[PDB]
Design a protein around this ligand. Structure first.
Ligand code: APC
Ligand code: PH2
Ligand code: CL
Ligand code: MG
Length: 158
């Protein structure tokens, strides 16, 4: 199954964080990277007392169960010093979001796929569109037509 993973970092040298994340993603068992996007510098969504993000997307072929993939992405976050605090939408060294897991629809306590807010976020959709221009969501919507509808600001390279 092809999983699409969003990468974000705005602490502790985001370029190094994203490169480390890509290396680690490729080392996940029973999985391999298919495609990687460019790196983008994006202004923060949410609180404004935090640095700009590096955002990117990856396509990962995997035979892991989705929750097992999640276990691995969370391990990578922790390896790269991810902490969590009370604030929502706050800064982080590394975040990995499972945007899609094939065409699956998953609604569980630990895991919601497609990612619950991605259709509202240019910083998730644009890097995804770079690597999967033909992508269709489980609900039948085309990524290309969502981007044209919402007309989110285009991104700048990191
Ligand atoms: N599709 C998905 N990808 C990654 N984590 C997911 C997920 N669906 C649910 N989660 C849950 O997300 C929790 C961690 O949330 P956080 O990483 O703190 C929010 P965030 O990723 O910073 O912002 P966002 O969810 O608003 O994009 C995990 O414990 C995990 O169970
Ligand atoms: N530009 C940008 N802003 C964000 C990001 C992200 O990846 N990029 N993720 C967040 C999740 O809470 C908080 N805000
Ligand atoms: Cl959908
Ligand atoms: Mg997260």
């Amino acid at each position: 199954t092809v999983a699409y993973i969003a990468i974000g970092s705005n602490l502790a040298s985001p370029l190094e964080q994203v490169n480390a994340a890509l290396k680690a993603l490729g080392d996940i068992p029973e999985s391999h990277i298919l495609t990687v996007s460019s790196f983008y510098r994006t202004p923060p969504l949410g609180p404004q007392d935090q640095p700009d993000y590096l955002n990117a997307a990856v396509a990962l072929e995997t035979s892991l169960a989705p929750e097992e993939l999640l276990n691995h992405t969370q391990r990578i976050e922790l390896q790269q010093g991810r902490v969590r605090k009370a604030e929502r939408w706050g800064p982080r060294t590394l975040d990995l979001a499972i945007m899609l897991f094939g065409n699956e629809v998953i609604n569980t306590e630990r895991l919601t796929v497609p990612h619950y807010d991605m259709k509202n976020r240019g910083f998730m959709l644009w890097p995804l569109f770079e690597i999967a221009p033909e992508l269709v969501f489980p609900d039948g919507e085309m990524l290309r037509q969502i981007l044209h509808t919402r007309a989110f600001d285009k991104l700048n390279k990191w």
